[PDB]
mmCIF file with all atom_site columns, C-alpha atoms in Angstrom:
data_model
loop_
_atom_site.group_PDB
_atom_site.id
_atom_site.type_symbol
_atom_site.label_atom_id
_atom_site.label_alt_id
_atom_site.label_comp_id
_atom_site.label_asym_id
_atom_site.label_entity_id
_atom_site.label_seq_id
_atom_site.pdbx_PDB_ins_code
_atom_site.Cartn_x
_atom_site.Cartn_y
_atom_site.Cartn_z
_atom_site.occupancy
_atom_site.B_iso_or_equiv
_atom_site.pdbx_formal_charge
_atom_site.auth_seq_id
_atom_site.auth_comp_id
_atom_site.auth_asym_id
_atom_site.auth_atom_id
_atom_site.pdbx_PDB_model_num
ATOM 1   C CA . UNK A 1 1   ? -30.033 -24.595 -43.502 1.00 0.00 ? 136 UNK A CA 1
ATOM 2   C CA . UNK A 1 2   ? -28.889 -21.111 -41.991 1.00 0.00 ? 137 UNK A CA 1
ATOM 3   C CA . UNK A 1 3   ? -30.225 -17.920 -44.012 1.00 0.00 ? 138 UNK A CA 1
ATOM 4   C CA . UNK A 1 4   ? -27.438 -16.664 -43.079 1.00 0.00 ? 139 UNK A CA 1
ATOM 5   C CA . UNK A 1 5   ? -23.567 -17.400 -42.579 1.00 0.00 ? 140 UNK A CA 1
ATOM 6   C CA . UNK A 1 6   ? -20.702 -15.333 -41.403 1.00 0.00 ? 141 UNK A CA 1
ATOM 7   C CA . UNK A 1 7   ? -16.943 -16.321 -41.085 1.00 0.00 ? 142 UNK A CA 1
ATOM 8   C CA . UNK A 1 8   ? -14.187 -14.091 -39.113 1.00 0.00 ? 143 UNK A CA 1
ATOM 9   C CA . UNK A 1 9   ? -10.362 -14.211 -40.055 1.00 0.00 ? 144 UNK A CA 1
ATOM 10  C CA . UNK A 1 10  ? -8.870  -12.220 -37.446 1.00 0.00 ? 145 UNK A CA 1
ATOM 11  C CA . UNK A 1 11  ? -5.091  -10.946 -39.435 1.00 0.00 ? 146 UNK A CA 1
ATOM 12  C CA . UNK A 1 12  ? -2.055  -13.305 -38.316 1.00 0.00 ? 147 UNK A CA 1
ATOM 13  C CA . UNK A 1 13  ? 0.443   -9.579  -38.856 1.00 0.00 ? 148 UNK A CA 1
ATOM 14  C CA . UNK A 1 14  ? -1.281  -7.244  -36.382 1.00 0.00 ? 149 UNK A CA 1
ATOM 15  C CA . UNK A 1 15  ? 0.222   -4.156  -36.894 1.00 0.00 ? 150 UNK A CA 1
ATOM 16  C CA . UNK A 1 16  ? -0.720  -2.860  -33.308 1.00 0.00 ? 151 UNK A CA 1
ATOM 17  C CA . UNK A 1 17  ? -1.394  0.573   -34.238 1.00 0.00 ? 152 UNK A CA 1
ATOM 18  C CA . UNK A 1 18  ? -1.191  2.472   -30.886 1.00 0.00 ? 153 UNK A CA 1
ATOM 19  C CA . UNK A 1 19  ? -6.229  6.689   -31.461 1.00 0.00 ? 154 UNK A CA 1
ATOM 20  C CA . UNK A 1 20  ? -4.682  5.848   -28.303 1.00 0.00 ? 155 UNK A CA 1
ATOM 21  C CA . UNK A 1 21  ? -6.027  3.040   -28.177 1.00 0.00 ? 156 UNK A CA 1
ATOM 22  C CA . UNK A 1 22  ? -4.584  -0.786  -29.058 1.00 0.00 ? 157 UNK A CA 1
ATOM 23  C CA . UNK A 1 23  ? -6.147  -1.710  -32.685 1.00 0.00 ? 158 UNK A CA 1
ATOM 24  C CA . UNK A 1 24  ? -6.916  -5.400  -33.718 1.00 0.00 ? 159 UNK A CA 1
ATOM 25  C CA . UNK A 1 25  ? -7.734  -5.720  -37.575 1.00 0.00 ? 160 UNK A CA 1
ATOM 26  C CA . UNK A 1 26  ? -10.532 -8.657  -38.482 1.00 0.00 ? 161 UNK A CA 1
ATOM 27  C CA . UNK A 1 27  ? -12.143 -9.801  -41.831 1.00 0.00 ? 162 UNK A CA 1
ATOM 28  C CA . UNK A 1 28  ? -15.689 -10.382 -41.716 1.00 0.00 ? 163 UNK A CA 1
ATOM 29  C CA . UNK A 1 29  ? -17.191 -12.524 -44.656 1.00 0.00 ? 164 UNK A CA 1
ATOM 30  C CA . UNK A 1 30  ? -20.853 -12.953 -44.327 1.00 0.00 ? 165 UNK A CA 1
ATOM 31  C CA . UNK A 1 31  ? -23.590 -14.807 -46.881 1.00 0.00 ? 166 UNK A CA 1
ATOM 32  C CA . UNK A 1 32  ? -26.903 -14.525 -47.374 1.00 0.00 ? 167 UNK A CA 1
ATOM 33  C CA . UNK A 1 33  ? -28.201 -17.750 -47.968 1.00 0.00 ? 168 UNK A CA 1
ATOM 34  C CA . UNK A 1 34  ? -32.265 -16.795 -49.101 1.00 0.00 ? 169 UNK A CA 1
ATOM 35  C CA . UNK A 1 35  ? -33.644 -15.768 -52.717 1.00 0.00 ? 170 UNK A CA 1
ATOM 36  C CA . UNK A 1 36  ? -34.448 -11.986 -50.823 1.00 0.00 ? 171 UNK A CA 1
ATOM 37  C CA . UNK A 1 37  ? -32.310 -9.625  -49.993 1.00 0.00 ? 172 UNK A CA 1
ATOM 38  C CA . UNK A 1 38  ? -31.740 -9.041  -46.602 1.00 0.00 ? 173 UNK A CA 1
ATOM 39  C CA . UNK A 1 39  ? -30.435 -6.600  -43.833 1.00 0.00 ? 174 UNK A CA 1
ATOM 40  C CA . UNK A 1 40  ? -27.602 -7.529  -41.010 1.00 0.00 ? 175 UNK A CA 1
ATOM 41  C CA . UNK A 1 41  ? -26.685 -5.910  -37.927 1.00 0.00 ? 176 UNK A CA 1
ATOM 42  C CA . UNK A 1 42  ? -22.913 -6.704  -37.103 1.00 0.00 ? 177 UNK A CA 1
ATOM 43  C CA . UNK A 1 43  ? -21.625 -6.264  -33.418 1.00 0.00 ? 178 UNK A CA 1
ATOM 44  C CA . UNK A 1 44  ? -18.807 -7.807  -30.807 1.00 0.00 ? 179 UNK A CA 1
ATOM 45  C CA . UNK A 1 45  ? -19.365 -8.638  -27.461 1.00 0.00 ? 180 UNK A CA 1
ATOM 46  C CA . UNK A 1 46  ? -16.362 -9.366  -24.985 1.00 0.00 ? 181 UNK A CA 1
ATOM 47  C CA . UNK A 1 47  ? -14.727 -6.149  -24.586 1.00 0.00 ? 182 UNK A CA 1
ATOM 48  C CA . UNK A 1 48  ? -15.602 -3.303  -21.749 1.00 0.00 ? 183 UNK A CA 1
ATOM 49  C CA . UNK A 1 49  ? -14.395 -0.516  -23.539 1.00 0.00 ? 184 UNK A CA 1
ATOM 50  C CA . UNK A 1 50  ? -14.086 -0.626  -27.328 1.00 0.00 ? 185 UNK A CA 1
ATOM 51  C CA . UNK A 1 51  ? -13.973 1.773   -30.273 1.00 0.00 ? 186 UNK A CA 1
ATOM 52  C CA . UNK A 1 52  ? -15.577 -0.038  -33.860 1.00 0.00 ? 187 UNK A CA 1
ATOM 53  C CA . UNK A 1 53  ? -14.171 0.620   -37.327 1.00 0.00 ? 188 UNK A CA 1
ATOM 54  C CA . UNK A 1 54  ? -16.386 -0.385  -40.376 1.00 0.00 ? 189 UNK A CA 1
ATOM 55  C CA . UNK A 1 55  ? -19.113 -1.661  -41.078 1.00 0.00 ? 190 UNK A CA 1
ATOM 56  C CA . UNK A 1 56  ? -22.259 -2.210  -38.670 1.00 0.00 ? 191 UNK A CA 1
ATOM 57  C CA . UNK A 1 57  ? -25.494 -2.528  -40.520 1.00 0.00 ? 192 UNK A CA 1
ATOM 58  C CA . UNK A 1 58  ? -25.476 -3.929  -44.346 1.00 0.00 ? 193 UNK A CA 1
ATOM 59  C CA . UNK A 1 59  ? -27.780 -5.368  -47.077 1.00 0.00 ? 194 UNK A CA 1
ATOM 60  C CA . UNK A 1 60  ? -27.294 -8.031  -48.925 1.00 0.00 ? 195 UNK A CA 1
ATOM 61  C CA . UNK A 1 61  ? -28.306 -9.405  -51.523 1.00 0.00 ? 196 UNK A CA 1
ATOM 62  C CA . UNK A 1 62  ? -29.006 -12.824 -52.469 1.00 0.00 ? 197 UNK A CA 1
ATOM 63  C CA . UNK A 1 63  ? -26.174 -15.310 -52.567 1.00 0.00 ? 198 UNK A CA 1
ATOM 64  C CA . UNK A 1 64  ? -24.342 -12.477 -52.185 1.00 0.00 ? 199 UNK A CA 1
ATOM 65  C CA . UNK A 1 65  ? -20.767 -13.059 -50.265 1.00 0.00 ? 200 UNK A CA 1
ATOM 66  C CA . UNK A 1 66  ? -19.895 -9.536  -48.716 1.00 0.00 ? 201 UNK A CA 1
ATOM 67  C CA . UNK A 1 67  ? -16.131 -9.003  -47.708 1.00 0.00 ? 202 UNK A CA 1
ATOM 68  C CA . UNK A 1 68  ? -15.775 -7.109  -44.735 1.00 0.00 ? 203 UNK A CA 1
ATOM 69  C CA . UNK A 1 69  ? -12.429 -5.648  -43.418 1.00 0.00 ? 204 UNK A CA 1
ATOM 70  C CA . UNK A 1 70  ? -12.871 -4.007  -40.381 1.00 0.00 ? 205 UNK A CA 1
ATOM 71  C CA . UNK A 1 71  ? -10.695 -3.075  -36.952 1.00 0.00 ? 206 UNK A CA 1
ATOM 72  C CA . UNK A 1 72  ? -11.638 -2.502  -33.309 1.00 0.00 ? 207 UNK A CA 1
ATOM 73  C CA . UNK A 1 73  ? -9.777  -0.224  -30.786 1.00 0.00 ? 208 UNK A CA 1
ATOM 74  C CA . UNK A 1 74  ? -9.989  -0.683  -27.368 1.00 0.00 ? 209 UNK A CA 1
ATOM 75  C CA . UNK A 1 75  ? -8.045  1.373   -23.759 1.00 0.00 ? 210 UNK A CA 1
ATOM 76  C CA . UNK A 1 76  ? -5.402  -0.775  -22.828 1.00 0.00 ? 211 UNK A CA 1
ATOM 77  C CA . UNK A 1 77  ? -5.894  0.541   -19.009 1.00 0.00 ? 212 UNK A CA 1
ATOM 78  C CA . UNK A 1 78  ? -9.753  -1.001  -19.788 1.00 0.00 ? 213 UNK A CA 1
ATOM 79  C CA . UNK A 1 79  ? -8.601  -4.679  -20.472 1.00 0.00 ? 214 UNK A CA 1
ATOM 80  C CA . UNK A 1 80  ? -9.165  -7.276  -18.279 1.00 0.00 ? 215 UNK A CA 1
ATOM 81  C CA . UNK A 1 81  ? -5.319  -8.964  -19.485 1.00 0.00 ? 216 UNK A CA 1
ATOM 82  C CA . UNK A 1 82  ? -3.716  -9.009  -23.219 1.00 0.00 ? 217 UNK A CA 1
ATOM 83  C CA . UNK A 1 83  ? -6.041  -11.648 -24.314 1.00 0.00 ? 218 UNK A CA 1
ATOM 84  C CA . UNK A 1 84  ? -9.636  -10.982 -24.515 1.00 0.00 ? 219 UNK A CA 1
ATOM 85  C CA . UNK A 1 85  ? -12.369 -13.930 -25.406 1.00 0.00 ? 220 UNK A CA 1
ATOM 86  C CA . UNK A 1 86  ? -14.551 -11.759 -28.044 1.00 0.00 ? 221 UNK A CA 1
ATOM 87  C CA . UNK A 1 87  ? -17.907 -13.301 -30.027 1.00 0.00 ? 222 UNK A CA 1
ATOM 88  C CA . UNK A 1 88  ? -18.616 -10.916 -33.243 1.00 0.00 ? 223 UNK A CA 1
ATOM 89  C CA . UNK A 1 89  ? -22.372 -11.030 -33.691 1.00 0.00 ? 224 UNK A CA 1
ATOM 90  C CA . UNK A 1 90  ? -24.661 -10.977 -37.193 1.00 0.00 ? 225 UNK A CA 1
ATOM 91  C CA . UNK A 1 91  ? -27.956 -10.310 -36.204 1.00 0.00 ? 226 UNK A CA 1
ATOM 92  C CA . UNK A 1 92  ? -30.739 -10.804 -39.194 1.00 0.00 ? 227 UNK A CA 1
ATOM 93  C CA . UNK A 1 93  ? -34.149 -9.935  -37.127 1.00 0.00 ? 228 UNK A CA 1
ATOM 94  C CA . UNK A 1 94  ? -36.089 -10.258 -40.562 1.00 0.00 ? 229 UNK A CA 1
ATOM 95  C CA . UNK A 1 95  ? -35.317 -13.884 -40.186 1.00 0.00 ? 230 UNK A CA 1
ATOM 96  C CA . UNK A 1 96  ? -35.211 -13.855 -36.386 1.00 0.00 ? 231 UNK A CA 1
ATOM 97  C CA . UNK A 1 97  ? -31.701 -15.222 -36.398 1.00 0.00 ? 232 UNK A CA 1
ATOM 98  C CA . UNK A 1 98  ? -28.043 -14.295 -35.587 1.00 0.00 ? 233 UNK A CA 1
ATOM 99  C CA . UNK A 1 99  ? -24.765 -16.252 -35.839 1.00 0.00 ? 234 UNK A CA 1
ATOM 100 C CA . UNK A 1 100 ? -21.890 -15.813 -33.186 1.00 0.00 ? 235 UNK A CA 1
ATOM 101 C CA . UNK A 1 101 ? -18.252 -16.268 -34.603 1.00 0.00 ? 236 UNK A CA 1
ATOM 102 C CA . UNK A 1 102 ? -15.794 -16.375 -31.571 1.00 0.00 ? 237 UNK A CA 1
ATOM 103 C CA . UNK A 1 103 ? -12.478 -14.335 -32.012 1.00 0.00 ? 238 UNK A CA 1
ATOM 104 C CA . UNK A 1 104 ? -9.532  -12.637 -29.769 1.00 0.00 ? 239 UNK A CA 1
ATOM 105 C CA . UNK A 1 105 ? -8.712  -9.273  -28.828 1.00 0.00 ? 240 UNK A CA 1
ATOM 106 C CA . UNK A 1 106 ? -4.772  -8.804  -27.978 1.00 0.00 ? 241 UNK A CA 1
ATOM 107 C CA . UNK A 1 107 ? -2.955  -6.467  -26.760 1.00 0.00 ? 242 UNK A CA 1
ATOM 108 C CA . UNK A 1 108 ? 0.838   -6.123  -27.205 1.00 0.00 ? 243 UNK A CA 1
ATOM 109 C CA . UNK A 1 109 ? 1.973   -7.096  -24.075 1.00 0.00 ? 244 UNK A CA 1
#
């Protein structure tokens, strides 16, 4: 049984905000699963330049469900092509433990 959990919904309308930089908005929900309360690091990995919006490092209490809306940015000249393979990251070191949710980073075009 995982002290922690963490889902992603990555938003169906992406409003593209063009920051110069393209904008992809993302929901984080994240649980902490133990009778202590406990502190997260949250992170992405995937993308070779990118700007984060919102929340990084949390606490949370227990059973707490934390909802978490969030965006990244990212230099369109920087991405590989308009769809990017991204993992966001919740790393709990007090518990030696993280979870990796898979999500997308697209572009426009």
């Amino acid at each position: 049984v995982d002290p922690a959990g963490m889902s992603v919904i990555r938003d169906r309308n992406q409003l593209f905000r063009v920051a110069g930089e393209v904008e992809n908005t993302y929901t984080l929900k994240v649980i902490n699963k133990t009778q202590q309360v406990q502190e997260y690091n949250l992170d992405v990995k995937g993308l070779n330049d990118v700007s984060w919006y919102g929340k990084q490092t949390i606490q949370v209490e227990p059973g707490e469900v934390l909802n978490l809306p969030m965006s990244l940015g990212a230099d369109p000249d920087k991405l590989n092509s308009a769809i990017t393979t991204i993992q966001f990251i919740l790393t709990d070191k007090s518990n030696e433990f993280t979870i990796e949710v898979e999500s997308r980073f697209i572009k426009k075009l």
